[PDB]
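Re: your question about Endolysin mtEC340M

S., sorry for the slow reply, the queue was backed up all week. Below is exactly what I fed in.
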Amino acid sequence: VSRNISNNGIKFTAAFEGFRGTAYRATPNEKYLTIGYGSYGPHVEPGKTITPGQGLLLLNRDMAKAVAAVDAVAHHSLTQSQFDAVCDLVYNAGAGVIAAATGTGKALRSGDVATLRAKLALFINQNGKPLLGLRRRTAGRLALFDGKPWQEAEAIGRAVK
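Result:
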């Protein structure tokens, strides 16, 4: 059976990406505009405005490749939540982190839930050093992995100091 990121997972990702209702250029060097939950590309038209509900639809569509990468190799005994949490990791940090040779990627493939969660807890670094935002998103990501509603996963993430 083919899997999809659940609504609880889309809303977890959405809470950490943050919503902007009006097209805007996030940095002056980027060729394209951004809108909604980090949606970026040729489709974003100057002066476009959208609602949060439209943002979730876009986000779900923008997460398509991450969902396919996780779905193609994750053990079918993962829960929906555990699958959701990996979908957020792969969307955030790229699909390299679940390559067949990594430790994350072999626990994912075998369904070693306990190891998978321990590996998930380590993605807090940028260029080899801890970053507070990645500790927050990871902490909440671990709460999502454990089955908690996105609202609680978010709060658990952001309460990390």
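The CA atoms of residues 99 and 105 lie 5 Å apart. The beta strands are 20-24, 34-36, 39-40, 125-126, 129-130.

Happy to talk it through on Thursday.
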